[PDB]
Design an enzyme around this catalytic site. Structure first.
Site, short mmCIF file in Angstrom:
data_model
loop_
_atom_site.label_atom_id
_atom_site.label_comp_id
_atom_site.label_asym_id
_atom_site.label_seq_id
_atom_site.Cartn_x
_atom_site.Cartn_y
_atom_site.Cartn_z
CG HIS A 135 -1.69 1.32 1.33
ND1 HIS A 135 -3.23 1.35 1.06
CD2 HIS A 135 -1.58 2.37 1.80
CE1 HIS A 135 -3.60 2.34 1.30
NE2 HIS A 135 -2.60 3.36 1.88
CD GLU A 136 1.76 3.67 3.44
OE1 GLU A 136 2.24 4.88 3.13
OE2 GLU A 136 0.75 3.81 4.04
CG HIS A 193 0.40 6.06 -0.66
ND1 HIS A 193 -0.85 6.68 -1.39
CD2 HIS A 193 -0.08 5.36 0.38
CE1 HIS A 193 -1.67 6.44 -0.40
NE2 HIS A 193 -1.38 5.87 0.40
CD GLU A 242 -4.36 6.95 2.16
OE1 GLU A 242 -4.38 5.73 1.68
OE2 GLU A 242 -3.51 7.25 2.73
ZN LIG Z 1 -2.42 5.15 2.10
#
Ligand SMILES: [Zn+2]
Length: 416
Positions: free
Chosen positions: A222-223, A226, A261
């Site tokens: 997930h990170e 980003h 997000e």
């Molecule tokens: Zn996030």
């Protein structure tokens, strides 16, 4: 990505892939031992009290002042053994991510996503931006500047506040102008969160909901997603938020989630984003990429001693998938851009990673975590690259039992 070298925190510094470094800071920090686990990617097994001056201590706020969704322990990650375990845990999660076709692609995109050389005040000169580098200490205490794309570092005061951050610029919006910037991910493989999920096929949930734990590999992925958006300068402004509207009346009335997000999570969540707003962003960044091709076309000189101008031009042709004509001039092909953009924003999502890992996960980003658990992913008997907690050839490989905090209670220690 793949770590083709065994790293032990105790290994001696060699100034190459094991050394003490300093990051572009405001306060004269003391160097920290870091490890280059793969090209352009380093791991700093230290609590983050360096990147941001305001966060220069691990002191927890007043008991009655700390949010319900947090965890403090100024002692975490203070010993060599903990740092060694942290290093081994991070390395292992990268391998698990790399083991999937989706993960290998994402990591390949990250390594290729070198922050653009847009630091000159002269529009015909290419120059690296200082904050997209770290300083590697040499035997004589001297420093060597080295470019990098990603740094995995320990969390700050709040141990569970994982995030992808980076240094800004006086005028440039690096995470949103197509340039990109070196990314710092505050993260820990030593803890995870619990969530509720009902696997009940029948219609008799008269006993409650099951208690499961998030697979750390998914949290890191997930990170990293980003980081991908930010390395390619296409992150959505954090001020662009969403107030759930499955049932909304007027001018908010409940929690809120950012577009960045929702996009990163994927699944039904991302499907909420208006296809119109989506194209608006795509065309916007398509033009930012065109401005970059233009900058490269106009470049006549370069700063630095190692790389020639043609070398860096090639680096960015590769990064942004630019087309080059016989004249050597660059242009952005709509088709290629759309493909890259879709890859970074629609294909690389948390939801899609859950599919590749075949694990149980929150169905929505809106599914708030219930607790924080202490874990240890290093031992092979507890977690593996291919199955995570759900060890094949064991009961844990049935009904996601490995992620069930009740059943596999020996792998999850509740802390809050
Ligand atoms: Zn996030």
């Amino acid at each position: 990505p793949f770590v083709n070298k065994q790293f032990n925190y105790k290994d001696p510094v060699n100034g190459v892939d094991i050394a003490y470094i300093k990051i572009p800071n405001a306060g004269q920090m003391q160097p920290v031992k870091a490890f280059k686990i793969h090209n352009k990617i380093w791991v700093i097994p230290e609590r983050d009290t360096f990147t941001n001056p305001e966060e220069g201590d691990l002191n927890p706020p007043p008991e009655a002042k700390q949010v319900p969704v947090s965890y403090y322990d100024s002692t975490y990650l203070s010993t060599d053994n903990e740092k060694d375990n942290y290093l081994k845990g991070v390395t292992k999660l990268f391998e698990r991510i790399y083991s999937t076709d989706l993960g290998r692609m994402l990591l390949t995109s990250i390594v290729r996503g070198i922050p653009f050389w847009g630091g000159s005040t002269i529009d015909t000169e290419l120059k690296v931006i200082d904050t997209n580098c770290i300083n590697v200490i040499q035997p004589d205490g001297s420093y060597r500047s080295e470019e990098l794309n990603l740094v995995i570092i320990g969390p700050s005061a709040d141990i569970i506040q994982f995030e992808c951050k980076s240094f800004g610029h006086e005028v440039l919006n690096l995470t949103r102008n197509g340039y990109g910037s070196t990314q710092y991910i505050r993260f820990s493989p030593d803890f995870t969160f619990g969530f509720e999920e009902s696997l009940e096929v029948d219609t008799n949930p008269l006993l409650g909901a099951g208690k499961f734990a998030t697979d750390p590999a998914v949290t890191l992925a997930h990170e990293l997603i980003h980081a991908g958006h930010r390395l390619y300068g296409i992150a959505i402004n954090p001020n662009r938020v969403f107030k759930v509207n499955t049932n909304a009346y007027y001018e908010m009335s409940g929690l809120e989630v950012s577009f960045e997000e929702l996009r990163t999570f994927g699944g039904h969540d991302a499907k909420f984003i208006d296809s119109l707003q989506e194209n608006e962003f795509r065309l916007y960044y398509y033009n930012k990429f065109k401005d970059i091709a233009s900058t490269l076309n106009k470049a006549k000189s370069i700063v630095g001693t190692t790389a020639s101008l043609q070398y860096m031009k090639n680096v960015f042709k590769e990064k942004y998938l630019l087309s080059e004509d016989t004249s050597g001039k660059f242009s952005v092909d709509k088709l290629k851009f759309d493909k890259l953009y879709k890859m970074l924003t629609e294909i690389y999502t948390e939801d899609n990673f859950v599919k590749f890992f075949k694990v149980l996960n929150r169905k929505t980003y809106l599914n708030f975590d219930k607790a924080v658990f202490k874990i240890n992913i290093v031992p092979k008997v507890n977690y593996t690259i291919y199955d995570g907690f759900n060890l094949r050839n064991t009961n844990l490989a049935a009904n996601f039992n490995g992620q069930n905090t009740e059943i596999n209670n020996m792998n999850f220690t509740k802390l809050k």
